[PDB]
Design a binder for this molecule. Structure first.
Ligand SMILES: CCOP(=O)(Cc1ccc(C)cc1)OCC
Ligand SMILES: CCOP(=O)(Cc1ccc(C)cc1)OCC
Ligand SMILES: CC(C)OP(C)(=O)OC(C)C
Ligand SMILES: CC(C)OP(C)(=O)OC(C)C
Ligand SMILES: [Zn+2]
Ligand SMILES: [Zn+2]
Ligand SMILES: [Zn+2]
Ligand SMILES: [Zn+2]
Lengths: 331, 330
């Protein structure tokens, strides 16, 4: 509750500083990176790409990033540790399950999944001794039975460890509502959960409803936009057609209603991406050359130029993250 | 002339008694490294594997083909380690089964071709261990992805000479569509083994494929839920046909003159996480002999039913060697 686990070890709350709460070094699949490294050029190249990108964010002031890649996202902790050490940026690793779990998981029970999540947070990931500092879960519209189980196990592990929960939603379908439901049914405090991909909807009504209950709202895909790239059906399907300004304004909307303490902002960027069409990255890097630095460089000043006081900006990027990430046990 | 094993190349003559469809562990990609305790421990699994392989060895088995693909959680390093301890040759595989992740499902036929060749020519992961066979699958009518897979499989095979082995839903006659696709890519049937064939009682479906030149895989002989019907999961997986019935299919094809087209295995495993928890315990109760089941029980049974030893020797020694030998097209 005093220290936060990173792939380099524990750090104190003050050490975290400017923190990006939903990012990825690589978006892939379990075992993929070890089996076919050439799909990304080479492991060495994915790594140099990541270090450069991370150095750039650090220059703009980023000190910590939370890589929310789960086992099924193809998380490679060794990879995380190596770029973390090289770029000198702290990286928080995750446990949980995304939406592409293999058979060996789909068949597990809630109790077995609970153990698995606990193993990762308390014992370490694989045989590295590296501990996860966050649990990631997801739904794609109406939850599946399996998904239901996932949410429950995430809640149990969190209750037992004090580590927070972060989710992937289909904002459009108001997933957040169903997720809150399950978590509360487990006794988990909304203050330990972040409902992500929220900037993906314009429904301010949905957002404040959640904000109002004590949840954290993740506005994490700021730079995601296929505007001008309407040519590409695939890019458009992923990126959406709302501009980044539209997304950034939600941030101001929430502040305005008085929810500055429940806002978490991120880019949801990546340096590699195998779980999608081939060459989607190329397209992405074209739309956002700034990568992870996009927030500090572009969103921050923009929000400033619109009436938001710097100090408020500092609380959303430093203060909220710290409070969220510190392991906290229920009274 | 030389077959690729997890310990290196071997000459055809060293293969000897070969079991063509087995598994050291039946899991998922990354699973064993992430949650070894699910199996007791990695060390425990390994030790179990070494034991049962030494027993099979005792009985005469010299080589085993582990048909575990990437998505089956194949761990080449585990394989090498137990091959070394037991002193049994193990042949590894490339290909895809029916649980591919997004990263795989989204690739093109050309991409898939590359991955399979990589595993066969360059090696598995970073180990340098080369695959000696390609495993594919269908579970009834092929999906479009599955179609691509079968195509890339056929292509990798043509370029390398390495045989192809498949999983099928025998009862749905999957073999027929697989052949159609394979033939369309130019692949010769003699390079292909249509697996799980013992899962059907339809002799006509089997003789037709044999006639065309395919190898028939009669590989789940010991799989039977007979007396375990109180267990639905178990029964769903093992079936309720007895081991004798499966074995007889072997005699049935010999009798039709296709002994040269027959391949026999157990489809056994020492670890199994892609199923209900505790299935292994059920399985080990059903077949204490493990992989030695073939030699200790099927051979003697067949001999007793009138099959000449020598014929038996052709099936377990000669057929595999021919199948396994990397064969290029004319
Ligand atoms: C064997 C995996 O460890 P374990 O069962 C018990 C365990 C937890 C933490 C440490 C430091 C050692 C051992 O993990 C807890 C869920
Ligand atoms: C995986 C990178 O190697 P490669 O492109 C070419 C390659 C094949 C074999 C050997 C021994 C070295 C290199 O793999 C074959 C498709
Ligand atoms: C793959 C897409 C469709 O979903 P997402 C945005 O959670 O992917 C992660 C890996 C960024
Ligand atoms: C339902 C699945 C588990 O069938 P199968 C027989 O191909 O599994 C292998 C890994 C033994
Ligand atoms: Zn997501
Ligand atoms: Zn993400
Ligand atoms: Zn099979
Ligand atoms: Zn099998």
């Amino acid at each position: 509750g005093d220290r936060i686990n990173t792939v380099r070890g524990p750090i104190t709350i003050s050490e975290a500083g400017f923190t990006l709460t939903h990012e990825h070094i690589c978006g892939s699949s379990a075992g993929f990176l070890r089996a076919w490294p050439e799909f990304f050029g080479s492991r060495k190249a994915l790594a140099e790409k990541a270090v450069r990108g991370l150095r750039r964010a650090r220059a703009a002031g980023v000190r910590t990033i939370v890589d929310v890649s789960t086992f099924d996202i193809g998380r490679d902790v060794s990879l995380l540790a190596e770029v973390s050490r090289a770029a000198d940026v702290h990286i928080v690793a995750a446990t949980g399950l995304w939406f592409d779990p293999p058979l060996s998981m789909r068949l597990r029970s809630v109790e077995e999944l609970t153990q698995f999540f606990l193993r990762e947070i308390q014992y370490g990931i694989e045989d590295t001794g590296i501990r996860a500092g966050i649990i990631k879960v997801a739904t794609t519209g109406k939850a599946t039975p399996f998904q239901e189980l996932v949410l429950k196990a995430a809640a149990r592990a969190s209750l037992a460890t004090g580590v927070p929960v972060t989710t992937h939603t289909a904002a459009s379908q108001r997933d957040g509502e169903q997720q809150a439901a399950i978590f509360e049914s487990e006794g988990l405090s909304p203050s330990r959960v972040c409902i992500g991909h929220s900037d993906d909807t314009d429904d301010l009504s949905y957002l404040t409803a959640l904000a109002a209950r004590g949840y954290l709202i993740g506005l994490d895909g700021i730079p995601w936009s296929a505007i001008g790239l309407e040519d590409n059906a695939s890019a458009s399907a992923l990126l959406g057609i709302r501009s980044w300004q539209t997304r950034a304004l939600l941030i101001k909307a929430l502040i305005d209603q008085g929810y500055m303490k429940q806002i978490l902002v991120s880019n949801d960027w990546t340096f590699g991406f195998s779980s999608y069409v081939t060459n989607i990255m190329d397209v992405m890097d074209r739309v956002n050359p700034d990568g992870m630095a996009f927030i500090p460089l572009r969103v921050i000043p923009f929000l400033r130029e619109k009436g938001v006081p710097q100090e408020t900006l500092a609380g959303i990027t430093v203060t909220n993250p710290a409070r969220f990430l510190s392991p906290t046990l229920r009274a």
